[PDB]
Design an enzyme around this catalytic site. Structure first.
Site, PDB file in Angstrom:
ATOM      1  N   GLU A 295       1.156  -1.309  -0.361  1.00  0.00           N
ATOM      2  CA  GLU A 295       0.014  -0.463  -0.231  1.00  0.00           C
ATOM      3  C   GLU A 295       0.863   1.398   0.001  1.00  0.00           C
ATOM      4  O   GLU A 295       0.015   2.248  -0.263  1.00  0.00           O
ATOM      5  CB  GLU A 295      -0.667  -0.001   1.672  1.00  0.00           C
ATOM      6  CG  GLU A 295      -2.661   0.080   0.339  1.00  0.00           C
ATOM      7  CD  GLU A 295      -2.971  -0.943   1.376  1.00  0.00           C
ATOM      8  OE1 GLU A 295      -3.045  -1.376   0.492  1.00  0.00           O
ATOM      9  OE2 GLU A 295      -3.716  -0.670   2.042  1.00  0.00           O
ATOM     10  N   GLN A 296       2.073   1.009  -0.064  1.00  0.00           N
ATOM     11  CA  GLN A 296       3.361   2.498   0.126  1.00  0.00           C
ATOM     12  C   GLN A 296       2.724   3.847   0.894  1.00  0.00           C
ATOM     13  O   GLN A 296       2.298   4.640  -0.324  1.00  0.00           O
ATOM     14  CB  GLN A 296       3.729   2.519  -0.964  1.00  0.00           C
ATOM     15  CG  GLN A 296       4.292   0.675  -1.501  1.00  0.00           C
ATOM     16  CD  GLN A 296       5.727   1.280  -2.639  1.00  0.00           C
ATOM     17  OE1 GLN A 296       6.601   0.905  -2.027  1.00  0.00           O
ATOM     18  NE2 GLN A 296       5.594   1.455  -3.865  1.00  0.00           N
ATOM     19  N   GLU A 297       1.704   3.449   1.946  1.00  0.00           N
ATOM     20  CA  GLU A 297       1.275   4.704   2.042  1.00  0.00           C
ATOM     21  C   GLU A 297       1.970   5.363   3.285  1.00  0.00           C
ATOM     22  O   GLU A 297       3.536   4.993   4.004  1.00  0.00           O
ATOM     23  CB  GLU A 297       0.143   3.823   2.901  1.00  0.00           C
ATOM     24  CG  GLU A 297      -0.566   5.093   4.275  1.00  0.00           C
ATOM     25  CD  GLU A 297      -1.647   4.316   5.416  1.00  0.00           C
ATOM     26  OE1 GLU A 297      -2.767   3.514   5.511  1.00  0.00           O
ATOM     27  OE2 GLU A 297      -1.368   3.758   5.792  1.00  0.00           O
ATOM     28  N   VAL A 298       2.577   6.662   2.998  1.00  0.00           N
ATOM     29  CA  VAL A 298       2.501   7.719   3.549  1.00  0.00           C
ATOM     30  C   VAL A 298       1.197   8.536   4.776  1.00  0.00           C
ATOM     31  O   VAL A 298       0.580   8.979   4.251  1.00  0.00           O
ATOM     32  CB  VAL A 298       3.258   8.765   2.960  1.00  0.00           C
ATOM     33  CG1 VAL A 298       3.372   9.934   3.312  1.00  0.00           C
ATOM     34  CG2 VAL A 298       4.543   7.739   2.414  1.00  0.00           C
ATOM     35  N   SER A 299       1.531   8.478   5.724  1.00  0.00           N
ATOM     36  CA  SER A 299       0.806   9.002   6.749  1.00  0.00           C
ATOM     37  C   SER A 299       0.758  10.709   7.329  1.00  0.00           C
ATOM     38  O   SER A 299       2.510  10.830   7.309  1.00  0.00           O
ATOM     39  CB  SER A 299      -0.083   8.538   8.113  1.00  0.00           C
ATOM     40  OG  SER A 299      -0.222   6.868   7.411  1.00  0.00           O
TER      41      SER A 299
END
Lengths: 175, 103, 41, 103, 103, 103, 103
Positions: A97-101
């Site tokens: 998902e290579q999510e950045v929060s």
């Protein structure tokens, strides 16, 4: 730039000082104090952005399927953002998902602009945010994983607080 | 009274409207002796100053010299687009007489 | 200890409050109107 | 005293309220000798000004003249909404006497 | 010297503490002759003024009057909440004497 | 000349450094007769004041006291953290002589 | 007049342009008698001051020293990068004489 698809219209997003998590009524609301935990978020005070228009649109399409309209906000990089696969390491629950929060939500001055999406089809017209702060965000970037580690939030008995690199940044009573 | 910067600029000897339509590229401020001045530059190459106070300035114009510097400083930090300037085209760099911004 | 879970919440909130003041220095400085100290004293 | 801009506007000679409820479309500022003034415009098409000081201004008005110029520079620059203007209409452009903003 | 607004307000005759805990609803500013003054209002209908400068006031007050109006503009523009107001109740609208804000 | 607030505070009689490393929790401003001052507090429980201009002050200080109040207002609204304070511990609340903020 | 800080500074004797291209690390403001000044530092360990108003100052410079201090408080607060500084090299710490910010 990072992309987040959302139903809420820009008038609303401006009324609230940004793209909020649940647990903030507007952005400087310290009235409700939200639980902030990265590990719990990833599985909780963070709002998830994507690295590409594609990814945000895809995530947007499952969640917001059958919405006749939603937007894809184009957010700048600044230090409230954390790359979730760099900080949680071999333990990221969703590595694909290579999510950045963003911790706290996303303030409206950090919103570069937005694309209108009708019937799940992206209208290529990027509407610019005149309130975006160009010189300030122009050279700011995502917080470094180094700084992320003390904030990972794995529970105290979690095998991560005893391995590299978290052992060297574990807080009081983790490990 | 003038209704526009062009209209206002019609009244002076040695003036020229310039259409900039751009935010400031540089801001310099000097408190050095006799050079108590502000120089601004646009990307187009045009340099313009807000001239030094002197006994040739009627007291009211002194007050306005201080307001123009304040306006240029905050226009520059807010990155705001200046639309047209009215400058005294007989001085180097051209002296700012008036300034308009739109939208 | 659950202390761990309480330390994460606190460090996280201190991270966020620092960021909020930077965001307030940016947008509140737009209203700051400078005074001619000399003509009012 | 009065308690609103309308009661304040009413106790004067040659005044009228303009319901604005919009932000300022343009800002013109001038340090040009003898016309040291600010002009503002709206989308409704009304030009207003803040007069040049002199002898229709009791020494207290001069402090408030400068404050009104400051207020209009920050409201413009930030796109803040003006609610109402009370102006003296015997002047061209009509001249500002008070301003109110509503949140 | 006093340490809280309530100690400060108490050295004066005809003052009163209002607890607000609210941002400003409206801000009216005026350069009308003999009516140079700011008026503010809150949702609950409290209306207060910064009075006109004049023989009532000691000269050192003059400069603080001006600073008060400055504070009142940016508090409004920033929606900062006001905690308490020490006002002079002998006139309408009540005059502001002191202000505190807390975060 | 002093290169740090610690150096600068050390050349005066009856001063004290306070490492604060925090934002202000409350701001109080007064324009009441003879109490024209600002009061700030921190969550430690500490309170400090900016002296009423008066009697044992150089006339240069008079201009600098007005700058201090302006810095304390905007430091409060933006929540910037004060680093150190140099204060005159022979007044109650103690008075501020210099302020530093880092990064 | 000069059109750049490099050119202005070159017109003086005992000045030195410094390219800083960074934001200020510290801000210290002192209202202490005979030390009413500002000191700023950079990451690089470099310290600069804005001189106490000495007798060798034209009133135009007097107003200009104040302005420079204004500029330095708002640059420090917004975290704006300074490009080059022009400073007097025969004073410790070095005295600011002019300033530029680019883009």
């Amino acid at each position: 730039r990072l992309y987040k698809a959302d139903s809420r219209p820009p008038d609303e997003i401006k009324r609230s000082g940004g793209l909020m998590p649940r647990g903030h009524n507007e952005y400087f609301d310290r009235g409700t104090q939200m639980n902030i935990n990265l590990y719990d978020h990833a599985r909780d005070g963070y709002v998830s952005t994507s690295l590409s228009l594609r990814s945000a649109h895809l995530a947007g399409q499952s969640i917001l399927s059958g919405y006749s309209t939603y937007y894809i906000y184009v957010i700048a990089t600044a230090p409230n953002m954390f790359n979730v696969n760099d900080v949680l390491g071999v333990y990221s629950p969703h590595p694909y998902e290579q999510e950045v929060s963003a911790l706290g939500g996303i303030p409206y001055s950090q919103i570069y602009g937005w694309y209108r999406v009708n019937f799940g089809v992206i209208d290529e017209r990027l509407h610019r945010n005149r309130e975006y702060r160009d010189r300030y965000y122009r050279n700011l970037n995502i917080a470094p994983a180094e700084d992320g580690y003390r904030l990972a939030g794995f529970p105290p008995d979690h095998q991560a607080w005893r391995e590299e690199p978290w052992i060297h940044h574990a807080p009081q009573g983790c490990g | 009274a003038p209704q526009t910067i062009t209209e206002l600029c019609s009244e002076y000897r040695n003036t020229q409207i310039y259409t900039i339509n751009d935010k400031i590229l540089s801001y310099t401020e000097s408190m050095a002796g006799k050079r108590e001045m502000v120089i601004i530059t646009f990307k187009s190459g045009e340099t313009f100053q807000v001239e030094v106070p002197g006994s040739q300035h009627i007291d009211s114009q002194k007050k306005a010299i201080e307001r123009m510097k304040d306006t240029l400083r905050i226009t520059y930090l807010t990155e705001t687009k200046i639309d047209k300037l009215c400058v005294w085209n007989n001085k180097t760099p051209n002296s700012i007489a008036a300034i308009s911004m739109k939208n | 200890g659950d202390t761990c879970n309480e330390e994460t919440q606190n460090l996280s909130t201190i991270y966020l409050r620092e960021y909020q003041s930077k965001v307030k220095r940016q947008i509140f400085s737009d209203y700051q109107s400078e005074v001619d100290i000399y003509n009012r004293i």
